[PDB]
Amino acid sequence: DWPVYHRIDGPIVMIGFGSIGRGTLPLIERHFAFDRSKLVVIDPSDEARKLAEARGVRFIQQAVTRDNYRELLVPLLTAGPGQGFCVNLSVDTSSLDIMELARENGALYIDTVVEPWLGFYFDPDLKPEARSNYALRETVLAARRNKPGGTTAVSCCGANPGMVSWFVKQALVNLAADLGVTGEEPTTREEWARLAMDLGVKGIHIAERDTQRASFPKPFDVFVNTWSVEGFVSEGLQPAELGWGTFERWMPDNARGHDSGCGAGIYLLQPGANTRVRSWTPTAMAQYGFLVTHNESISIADFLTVRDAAGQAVYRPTCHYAYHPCNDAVLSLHEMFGSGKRQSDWRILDETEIVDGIDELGVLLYGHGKNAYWYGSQLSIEETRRIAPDQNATGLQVSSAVLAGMVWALENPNAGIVEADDLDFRRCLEVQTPYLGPVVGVYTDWTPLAGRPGLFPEDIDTSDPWQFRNVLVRD
Amino acid sequence: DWPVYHRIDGPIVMIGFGSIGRGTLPLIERHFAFDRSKLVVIDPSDEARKLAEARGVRFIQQAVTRDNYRELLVPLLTAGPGQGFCVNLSVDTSSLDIMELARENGALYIDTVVEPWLGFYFDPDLKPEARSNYALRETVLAARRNKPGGTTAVSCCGANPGMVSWFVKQALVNLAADLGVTGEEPTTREEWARLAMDLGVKGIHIAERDTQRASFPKPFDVFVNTWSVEGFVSEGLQPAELGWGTFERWMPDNARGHDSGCGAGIYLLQPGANTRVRSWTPTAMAQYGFLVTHNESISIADFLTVRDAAGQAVYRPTCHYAYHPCNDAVLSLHEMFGSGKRQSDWRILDETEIVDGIDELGVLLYGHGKNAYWYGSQLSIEETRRIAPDQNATGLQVSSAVLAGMVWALENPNAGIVEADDLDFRRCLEVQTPYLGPVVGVYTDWTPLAGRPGLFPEDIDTSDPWQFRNVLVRD
Ligand SMILES: NC(=O)c1ccc[n+]([C@@H]2O[C@H](COP(=O)([O-])OP(=O)(O)OC[C@H]3O[C@@H](n4cnc5c(N)ncnc54)[C@H](O)[C@@H]3O)[C@@H](O)[C@H]2O)c1
Numbered sequence: 020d021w022p023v024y025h026r027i028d029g030p031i032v033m034i035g036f037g038s039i040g041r042g043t044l045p046l047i048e049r050h051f052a053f054d055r056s057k058l059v060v061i062d063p064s065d066e067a068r069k070l071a072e073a074r075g076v077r078f079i080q081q082a083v084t085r086d087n088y089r090e091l092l093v094p095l096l097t098a099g100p101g102q103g104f105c106v107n108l109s110v111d112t113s114s115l116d117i118m119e120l121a122r123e124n125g126a127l128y129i130d131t132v133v134e135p136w137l138g139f140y141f142d143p144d145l146k147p148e149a150r151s152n153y154a155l156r157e158t159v160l161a162a163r164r165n166k167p168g169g170t171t172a173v174s175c176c177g178a179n180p181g182m183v184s185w186f187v188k189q190a191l192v193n194l195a196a197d198l199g200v201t202g203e204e205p206t207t208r209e210e211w212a213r214l215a216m217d218l219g220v221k222g223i224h225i226a227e228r229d230t231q232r233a234s235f236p237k238p239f240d241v242f243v244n245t246w247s248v249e250g251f252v253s254e255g256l257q258p259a260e261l262g263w264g265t266f267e268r269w270m271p272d273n274a275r276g277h278d279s280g281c282g283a284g285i286y287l288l289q290p291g292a293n294t295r296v297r298s299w300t301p302t303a304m305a306q307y308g309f310l311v312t313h314n315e316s317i318s319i320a321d322f323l324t325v326r327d328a329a330g331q332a333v334y335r336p337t338c339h340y341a342y343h344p345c346n347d348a349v350l351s352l353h354e355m356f357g358s359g360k361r362q363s364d365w366r367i368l369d370e371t372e373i374v375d376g377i378d379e380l381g382v383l384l385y386g387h388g389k390n391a392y393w394y395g396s397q398l399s400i401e402e403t404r405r406i407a408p409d410q411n412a413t414g415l416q417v418s419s420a421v422l423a424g425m426v427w428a429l430e431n432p433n434a435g436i437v438e439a440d441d442l443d444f445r446r447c448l449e450v451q452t453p454y455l456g457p458v459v460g461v462y463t464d465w466t467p468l469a470g471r472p473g474l475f476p477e478d479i480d481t482s483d484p485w486q487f488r489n490v491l492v493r494d
Numbered sequence: 495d496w497p498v499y500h501r502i503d504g505p506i507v508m509i510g511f512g513s514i515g516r517g518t519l520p521l522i523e524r525h526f527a528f529d530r531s532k533l534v535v536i537d538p539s540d541e542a543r544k545l546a547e548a549r550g551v552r553f554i555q556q557a558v559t560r561d562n563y564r565e566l567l568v569p570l571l572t573a574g575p576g577q578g579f580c581v582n583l584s585v586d587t588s589s590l591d592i593m594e595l596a597r598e599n600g601a602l603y604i605d606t607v608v609e610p611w612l613g614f615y616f617d618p619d620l621k622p623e624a625r626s627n628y629a630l631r632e633t634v635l636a637a638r639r640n641k642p643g644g645t646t647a648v649s650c651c652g653a654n655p656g657m658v659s660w661f662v663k664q665a666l667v668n669l670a671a672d673l674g675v676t677g678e679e680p681t682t683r684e685e686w687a688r689l690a691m692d693l694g695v696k697g698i699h700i701a702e703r704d705t706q707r708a709s710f711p712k713p714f715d716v717f718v719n720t721w722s723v724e725g726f727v728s729e730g731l732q733p734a735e736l737g738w739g740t741f742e743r744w745m746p747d748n749a750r751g752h753d754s755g756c757g758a759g760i761y762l763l764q765p766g767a768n769t770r771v772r773s774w775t776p777t778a779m780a781q782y783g784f785l786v787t788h789n790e791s792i793s794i795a796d797f798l799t800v801r802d803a804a805g806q807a808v809y810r811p812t813c814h815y816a817y818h819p820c821n822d823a824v825l826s827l828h829e830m831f832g833s834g835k836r837q838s839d840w841r842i843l844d845e846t847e848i849v850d851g852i853d854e855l856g857v858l859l860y861g862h863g864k865n866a867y868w869y870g871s872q873l874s875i876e877e878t879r880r881i882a883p884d885q886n887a888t889g890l891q892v893s894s895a896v897l898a899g900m901v902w903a904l905e906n907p908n909a910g911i912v913e914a915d916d917l918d919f920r921r922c923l924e925v926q927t928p929y930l931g932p933v934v935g936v937y938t939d940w941t942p943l944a945g946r947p948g949l950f951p952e953d954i955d956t957s958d959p960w961q962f963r964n965v966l967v968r969d
């Protein structure tokens with residue numbers, strides 16, 4: 020039957036019961052030993068309350084805010100004598116403040132994004148740099164430096180960011196094998212970075228194609244997606260952002276860097292969900308993706324950075340998202356950006372409203388001796404329905420990663436603040452793999468210069484096909 | 495008891511029996527009186543043959559080519575007893591050559607596009623300038639200068655190009671009436687140009703939104719559209735092209751002009767169907783359109799040019815297409831450009847496969863004292879089904895414009911080569927209006943700087959919202 024990995028001894032407080040909370044609850048119930056009365060869900064929504072009541076789970080209908088979070092969460096995180104687990108799956112809440120609260124009260128923590136308090140983004144005097152995921156991430160790195168060790172808190176452990184960090188490692192191992200590079204698999208960050216450098220990985224796309232299709236035609240003035248509409252829109256309006264590789268020789272005139280921090284990233288002064296890049300996945304083959312900002316674009320490039328004695332980077336891969344969302348979401352973006360406003364209404368596709376499709380989510384490592392290698396999941400909606408309730412394929416990749424992260428945290432409860440790149444990738448993938456459908460690695464001869472130049476002249480660098488100059492779509 | 499407009503005392507030869515041919519034939523049968531055996535349809539397609547045969551239509555299965563066109567068409571067009579009519583609704587045939595042949599033999603002619611012989615649109619030595627609609631239109635204008643007068647031949651009389659030229663004239667009249675710039679209705683080209691100048695019309699979008707939705711999901715690797723896929727892809731891969739107004743103070747670095755010809759146009763060194771512009775229609779409100787090249791963009795701007803004594807343009811409007819095609823075609827374009835190749839298959843939406851929706855097609859005159867005014871048709875699929883068989887709402891707007899052009903040519907059969915702009919707009923709209931559903935004029939306060947600048951800096955011109963600099967999408 021289903022494996023039970025650990026006993027949870029304290030309260031489980033799930034913040035948020037949207038598409039991911041709903042998918043994660045049944046996995047938590049399935050894979051951990053605890054009395055159900057120990058778990059409670061907090062979410063302000065009436066729809067969420069109704070679903071919770073049908074599922075027989077404790078529910079508190081409240082919005083967690085900067086003004087109430089200490090008063091509200093401390094009693095819940097500290098109920099009884101066991102160590103609790105805060106599972107944060109919300110929007111509009113500060114990941115940093117909640118995480119720090121959990122740690123100071125001895126509870127484990129996990130989330131899937133570095134989220135700021137409601138109001139952060141539409142503040143009048145917020146500079147574009149301050150709206151970046153690089154800056155949000157630096158607040159978490161800062162917290163780690165300020166309080167080393169202590170109770171484990173896992174930042175950004177969803178599908179992406181999260182799982183894709185584990186795929187990068189598995190892909191590096193596979194590439195090393197296929198290129199005839201033999202030796203000890205790496206066990207430290209410095210060794211992972213050197214492996215990437217040695218293999219000649221110039222960069223990495225988080226290369227995703229969602230083919231889930233709805234049982235109804237897209238309504239006008241409704242934003243449709245397979246996961247958070249609020250979350251997608253929020254990240255889509257942040258600056259286009261990327262981990263910036265040492266091999267790059269060109270950047271747009273509207274690119275900018277950062278004065279402080281780890282140094283791994285740049286951003287563009289334009290929204291990521293309206294920025295296209297040339298990418299590839301096995302089912303899609305050549306496609307456009309959107310350059311949406313994501314924590315892993317920075318965290319993976321930072322993680323795989325090799326520095327010299329002086330502390331300067333000698334190697335770092337480029338890393339960014341190349342997202343082709345579901346058809347209705349592509350239409351929803353076209354509608355949003357063309358109108359200049361958010362749609363009147365929105366909805367997230369339920370599994371019962373999906374006629375077919377997969378969430379093809381993987382990592383595309385390029386520039387090495389086999390040109391490009393894609394490693395990841397081809398999870399279908401049909402498989403998802405069989406193996407995990409109350410979610411679509413997009414949801415299951417995320418919720419199963421949260422599960423893997425929780426397993427790791429309970430097995431390593433005094434690791435301090437950690438990112439998915441800090442977790443044991445094999446253990447995490449061992450826990451996750453049952454929920455990923457086919458996981459495959461395939462090589463391709465495709466490059467961003469495929470079929471170029473064509474009818475019209477373009478600004479391309481023919482000496483090096485993988486340069487960002489060739490990837491970025493100039494509109 | 496639909497009205498009959500004219501007797502036709504000679505052969506009617508329809509070249510092409512695709513989406514438009516299938517919608518046009520029943521209107522011809524409805525509105526003209528002729529020996530029914532005098533009509534014949536020529537198309538190489540097996541699908542076209544089976545359709546025609548199941549309806550008792552006289553059919554020749556052949557491709558009209560550079561090699562066979564004289565031998566094939568002369569006998570059909572001159573079969574008598576009186577003057578024939580060549581109705582060209584094909585792809586991959588030369589409009590110019592067929593039109594000149596019909597004229598040499600005294601047959602009336604009509605088409606909906608200036609099309610070249612097969613093979614034109616890919617050459618080792620075809621410069622982008624020579625692929626432009628401006629250049630193709632210059633061959634028609636040259637033909638007219640070469641042989642003035644004679645038998646009427648109507649160039650580019652579909653919905654757009656075609657009907658929209660009549661809409662521009664009606665809109666100019668309406669604007670004037672609303673603003674009391676009233677007087678004699680213009681009767682000459684120069685008077686129309688001066689009315690546009692006196693109203694302060696800085697430019698015109700052919701502003702279209704197709705909301706027809708398919709009853710089936712978007713198939714992978716199939717291009718879907720509501721009219722010719724071959725035709726749409728062809729124009730979509732031509733350079734983005736526009737009539738270029740005297741008020742414009744900026745153009746892209748990749749813009750180019752022409753050494754000769756009417757002087758009314760420029761082109762961009764990029765594909766039109768991958769070029770976005772900010773536009774507006776009544777149902778969509780603010781939307782993106784694609785800057786797809788079209789004959790009317792040049793013909794309307796040329797028609798409304800005012801010249802001083804020396805002969806240089808002192809006034810001309812900007813004019814271009816701002817096309818939001820149906821949801822499935824938007825996705826088809828994203829797929830084609832992202833993949834860098836044409837899909838393996840294609841499908842035109844039949845009326846029976848459309849859930850609901852309209853083809854909202856009009857002209858948006860901007861820059862004048864009332865900011866912006868949209869005039870056009872909001873024909874629904876439901877109304878289309880009640881009034882005309884075998885077509886969707888896109889098709890009916892085109893087929894009814896061909897009907898109107900045919901009526902005009904029969905009424906004025908010695909007018910020489912003529913464009914839509916040369917026809918009597920009131921008579922054509924009288925004929926066409928029963929097939930257009932609601933035809934409305936709407937003012938708006940929208941401009942291309944609505945909501946700008948916003949979260950990010952952009953190169954905009956705040957002194958004049960309507961500058962192309964502000965319309966063109968440059969992320
Ligand atoms: N790493 C990844 O792979 C990944 C993937 C998907 C989603 N996400 C992120 O995970 C989070 C959840 O995604 P989702 O699809 O479930 O979103 P969702 O929009 O479906 O649900 C969000 C929930 O948060 C609740 N909420 C809003 N404000 C709150 C508050 N102040 N306190 C408590 N709850 C509040 C809402 O009522 C809602 O039920 C989002 O932040 C999203 O960006 C990450």
Ligand SMILES: NC(=O)c1ccc[n+]([C@@H]2O[C@H](COP(=O)([O-])OP(=O)(O)OC[C@H]3O[C@@H](n4cnc5c(N)ncnc54)[C@H](O)[C@@H]3O)[C@@H](O)[C@H]2O)c1
Pocket residue numbers: 509510511512513514515536537538539542556557558559583584585586587606607609650651652653654655656721722723724725726842892
């Ligand atoms: N002005 C406008 O508003 C407008 C609107 C729609 C279409 N169009 C144009 O009208 C034309 C027809 O459109 P459609 O939607 O019917 O296209 P379609 O692609 O449905 O049909 C084209 C037909 O032409 C036939 N054909 C191909 N090669 C031929 C040849 N060598 N000789 C004879 N026939 C040949 C094909 O077999 C096909 O049946 C196209 O050129 C299109 O671009 C103009």
